[PDB]
Amino acid sequence: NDESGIPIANAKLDDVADLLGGALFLPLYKWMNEYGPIYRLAAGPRNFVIVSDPAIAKHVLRNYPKYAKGLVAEVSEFLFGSGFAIAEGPLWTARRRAVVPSLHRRYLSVIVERVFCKCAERLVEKLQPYAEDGSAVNMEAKFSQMTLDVIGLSLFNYNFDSLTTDSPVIEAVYTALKEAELRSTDLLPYWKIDALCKIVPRQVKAEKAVTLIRETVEDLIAKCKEIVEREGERINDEEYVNDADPSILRFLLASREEVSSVQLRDDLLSMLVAGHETTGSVLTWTLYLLSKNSSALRKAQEEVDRVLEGRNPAFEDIKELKYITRCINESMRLYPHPPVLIRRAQVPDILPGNYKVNTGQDIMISVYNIHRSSEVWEKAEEFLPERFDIDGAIPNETNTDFKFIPFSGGPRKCVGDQFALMEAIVALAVFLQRLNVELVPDQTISMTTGATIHTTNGLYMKVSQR
Ligand code: HEM
Ligand SMILES: CCCCCCCCS[C@@H]1O[C@H](CO)[C@@H](O)[C@H](O)[C@H]1O
Incomplete structure (x- = not known):
């Protein structure tokens, strides 16, 4: 008994290969089903408490800076410098407060x-x-x-x-x-x-x-x-x-x-990285999921045909592309980018369920596990945009109590969440307006994980004019 209350997962070399080799989701999911909503992975120099539970994830994400950015902020310093996506302390507080006002409604329109x-x-x-x-x-x-x-x-x-x-x-x-x-x-x-x-x-x-x-x-x-x-x-x-x-x-x-010139460069460079591959991967998996699910694709085309009648989307049209939005929401549930969120305890704390962690404890939240856990979601593996109330609020971490976590949460929540969702909605609506689409047969569409979940071998499609 180490008195933490946290079970310890028994990892083998094959699991470690998966953790280093772009298949991180695989052992973490297997261990969620064997050990439950929280367990420890201690592999050599690393010691992670892996969290697969909405209530614990909410506690960790909302309690910033008690849970600080940890290893992530340390590993990408070479690229972002002190850009506010990885900065902490009063610098982070000031730069985020300075940048968020730029993302206002008129700019989005x-x-x-x-x-x-x-x-x-x-x-x-x-x-x-x-x-x-x-x-x-x-x-x-x-x-x-x-x-x-x-x-x-x-x-x-x-x-x-x-x-x-x-x-x-x-x-x-x-x-x-x-x-x-x-x-x-x-x-x-x-x-x-x-x-x-x-x-x-x-x-x-x-x-x-x-x-x-x-x-x-x-x-x-x-x-x-x-x-x-x-x-x-x-x-x-x-x-x-x-x-x-x-x-x-x-x-x-x-x-x-x-603001110094270097800090501004670092800020904008962090937004360049934060806003690129995530959005591309969301669109990639949404298109894959629609090409596997003819009923959803048909409902998506019906909506874009009726709402726009062939026009380009305008800002005011986005709230009417409701089903297309839920298709993207359900894609981000099945395929979250990144599939795990990293934190580190800066003081001792007790997590919901009386699990004890010490100063310095590295934390991994498996958003992939939470989204795909049968303890959290019915039919967790199925692509069902209809699971969301089409007349209700767009789902997010607050209104689902961290059962759906598409844009993280708490003080470090993604600042481009409205921006990115609007980009996916508009691009997907324009695509579905202009092109029919079919998945090429005989492909293996499997996941490889990095900063995002991307495909192992590409996503090959056939398109034709509508
Ligand atoms: C679908 C597209 C996107 C996804 C899935 C996504 C995801 C995320 C997630 C999960 C985080 C939090 C990481 C953490 O808490 O450790 C985050 C943070 C951040 N995102 Fe996004 N993002 C997207 C689009 C964008 C866009 C378009 C921008 C810029 C216009 C952006 C800017 C940022 C920034 C600056 C942060 C750091 C916030 C902070 O630490 O204060 N993201 N993003
Ligand atoms: C011998 C060590 C055993 C494996 C340790 C976990 C490796 C899984 S990669 C994972 O992906 C994140 C985001 O991509 C990184 O930021 C994290 O630091 C990293 O943990």
């Missing part, structure tokens, strides 16, 4: 028209050769390109244009994301030694990518700042949008909050 619809129409245009010749297209890569192009336009008013062609800065983005994922699974953090970073090929390539990304963002910031200062631009209304530059960067510069 402008972005829907000029960014979400524009990039989704561009996606459809890039699919026209496949619609004509009937061949298969990897929609997971296409959605990744679209959501990258969206986030860059929304943050900087700059189009990476990865839907059209590759570029050095685009390659650098994926190189940086890869490095962040590998660092979370390295057996030995050799990259802490600076001399090894100068000779190990993976590290000298990662360092070049991070430099190019940081330089690109710095140049974008300096160019916008020159305009803002020269023109004497300041925020004078509530819900401010510069009509010529409807970007978050412009809003933040116009607000004239005291």
Whole structure:
């Protein structure tokens, strides 16, 4: 008896291979069913308390900073620096308070028209050769390109244009994301030694990518700042949008909050990463789930046909795309990004159920387990958008009491939750408006986990014009 009350899972080498190899969800789910809503994984240097229970997850997520960001904030410092997605303390409090006002309703309304619809129409245009010749297209890569192009336009008013062609800065983005994922699974953090970073090929390539990304963002910031200062631009209304530059960067510069240039670069870089692959993966799995579930796809097309009659979605249309919203909600239930949330106890605490943890205890919340647990959800493995009241509030962690956790919760909740849901709704509505879609047969659509749940082998679809 270690007096904590927490059962200890018995992990074998095969389980550890899964934890390091992109199949993290597999042993964690198996151990949830064997040991219950909370258990310990102590594998070598690591010691995690793994939480698979709504009530405990709620306690952990709402009690920030008692449960602090922990290992995650430490492993991705190389990419984000002190950007507020991983910063803590008064810096975090101030930067989040400064950035959240940029995501207001008028800004969202402008972005829907000029960014979400524009990039989704561009996606459809890039699919026209496949619609004509009937061949298969990897929609997971296409959605990744679209959501990258969206986030860059929304943050900087700059189009990476990865839907059209590759570029050095685009390659650098994926190189940086890869490095962040590998660092979370390295057996030995050799990259802490600076001399090894100068000779190990993976590290000298990662360092070049991070430099190019940081330089690109710095140049974008300096160019916008020159305009803002020269023109004497300041925020004078509530819900401010510069009509010529409807970007978050412009809003933040116009607000004239005291912030260093590097902190602003780090802030925007953290939003670039936070808003790209997550949104692309949500759209990927939603499209997969609809292509497996003809009744849902039919109901989704019926809604977009009736609500829009072929028009582009406007901001005011989004609240009427109710079933399409619940399709995305149910996709995020079955496939949460990331599938686990990380915390670390900063003081001793007692979790609901009288489970005791000490200062320093690393915590893993398996959102995948909570969403797929038969103790939490009926028919947990089925794609049923109808499980949500189509006339009720859109489900989230507060109104389901953390049985559904699509955007985390508590003080560190995702700040782009309204933004991202609106991007998925608009892009999926435009897709379903313009294209029929079928899953190519004989594929194995399986999960590989990193910062998001992505497919192991791609998501190949056939499309045709509607
Ligand atoms: C479907 C798309 C998205 C998903 C699934 C998602 C998911 C998440 C999750 C789970 C967290 C919390 C991590 C934690 O508590 O440890 C988070 C934080 C965050 N997200 Fe999102 N996100 C999405 C889109 C976006 C977008 C579009 C933006 C920016 C416009 C964004 C910006 C951020 C930021 C800045 C944070 C850090 C918040 C903080 O620590 O104070 N996300 N995201
Ligand atoms: C010998 C060690 C046994 C395996 C330890 C758990 C490895 C699972 S990867 C997991 O994914 C997160 C987000 O991607 C990272 O941030 C975490 O730090 C990391 O825990």
